């Protein structure tokens, strides 16, 4: 409303590193940077390995002529494998041309990136994620979507934060970083698992609620302030996370920007949490939005 | 398969397009194909030229080298200069190398597509919109935000569709498709002008309830059905726009995959709009969503 919304990078520098990784009959998407191919190691197993997989076992079984990397037409020859953690790595005999400037970053928990969607190494779709404080994301995912990847843009840098592993019964999602180190408590095999009760993502949602203000929606601000200690009461009654005097200093430029204290701004939320929002909406949403960090509010209102 | 996001075509074949077009102080973007830069015409105002501006006396006064065209950090020599109604059309001396596969269509209300925001010939962010009845879009745009353009890429061709122009005073958005003809009643001219009342639109509420059910999900369902016209006369008290025979026969293969007939789903919709979500969502939605078409439902649940 007023100007306002979800917004990904333009995916661009990311289209051009991906590539179809098939090992016997299983196919998902690698990301090729340099010379390296990295994709979801679960690509070596079999639907029945996936079940039950011994990864030691199954990578020693493999050899370089049992992957078939392909960018668009041309057939990568993999000159190289090895493991880190839950991702394959295939060294292929030509370096990515359209490789960006890039590195490897693991983001916290309230952290957003842009999802780049792939099948058969193909790029499909764009959407912008947030990583859940239950380490998992809410995203649009289908067979053969594992190895797309997550990732930041800050100038011409590309910061590649997820990989994309598998889908939980509650249907979000569950990765890596591009090192193959697990956001949350999930393992790489077609069992029994279940996110963890999700929390809200406390410094999102006011950070959401400064955007409404910049964007002239004022009807929740109120004459009172209070104290993280209240605020952080009524956010645990709420399944909010803790504020944190780290997440207010974070908040300080938007309580300038609007001339609204982090805590004045609290006391709305506590506001909305005890009495609701009244048939009212707040940039067109019914719900407290919390997938929208603080940078992300001022890259799209002052940037 | 219970994941469902606004989804944005990947950036990257448009990215490469997209270039600066400074006329004096006034720069905004361009869109470079083959040896043609394809910019909105007010690029040729100055500050007193925006209440009542004459294109065609403000361009007869330019000369080519009044065109600063830059491709990155590569200033493109312009050679060329013509209007088409509201787009001004630079050829210049280099075709650009990276032009991709594309097409020019002029689309209808209710359409989607994906807008590349770029500010200094330098894309920013990429978003889902579409074509609202009353022939604005709610878009994300500031200052230097025109000459964006709105796309889709289904099968390896993009289709340019939008490009922007002027904000309204609700904060909705006004352009041209790629011939330079204006969406909708607006003109190019800083004079009063207002979006028309805006509506629901229905054959999209109808598409995103479809994906609801394809996601597992009939809660809203409901022992009933409607006429055609019966539905029309409910609708239209909550400013839904008419269902058409021809949205009726769209509906048809989505209608066919889940086994819920079109007259049907609207049984439901009237219920829905009678008695809310009482705290339940759809789609992670409290708000009954129309920017998905039964084209993009097709595209996101299966191919
Ligand atoms: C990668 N190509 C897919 C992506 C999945 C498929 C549908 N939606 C997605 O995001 N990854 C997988 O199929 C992974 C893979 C085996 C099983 N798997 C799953 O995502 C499964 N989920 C789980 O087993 C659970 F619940 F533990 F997360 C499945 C039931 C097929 C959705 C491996 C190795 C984990
Ligand atoms: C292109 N660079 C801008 C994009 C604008 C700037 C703010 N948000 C946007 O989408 N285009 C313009 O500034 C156009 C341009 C003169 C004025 N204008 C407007 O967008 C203005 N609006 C209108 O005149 C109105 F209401 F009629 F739509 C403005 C008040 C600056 C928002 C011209 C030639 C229309």
Known sequence: QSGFRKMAFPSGKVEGC???VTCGTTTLNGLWL????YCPRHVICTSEDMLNPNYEDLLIR???HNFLVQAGNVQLRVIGHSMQNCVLKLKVDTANPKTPKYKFVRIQPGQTFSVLACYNGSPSGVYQCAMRPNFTIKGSFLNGSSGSVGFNIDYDCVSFCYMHHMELPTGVHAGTDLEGNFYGPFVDR???QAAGTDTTITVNVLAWLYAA???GDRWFLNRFTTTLNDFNLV????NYEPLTQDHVDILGPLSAQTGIAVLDMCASLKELLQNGMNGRTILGSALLEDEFTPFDVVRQCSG
Chains 1, 2 share one sequence.
């Open 34 to 37: 340099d010379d390296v191919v």
């Open 62 to 64: 493999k050899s370089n």
């Open 190 to 192: 077609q069992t029994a």
């Open 18 to 20: 991906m590539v179809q």
């Open 213 to 215: 203000v910049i964007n």
């Open 235 to 238: 956010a645990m009654k709420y």
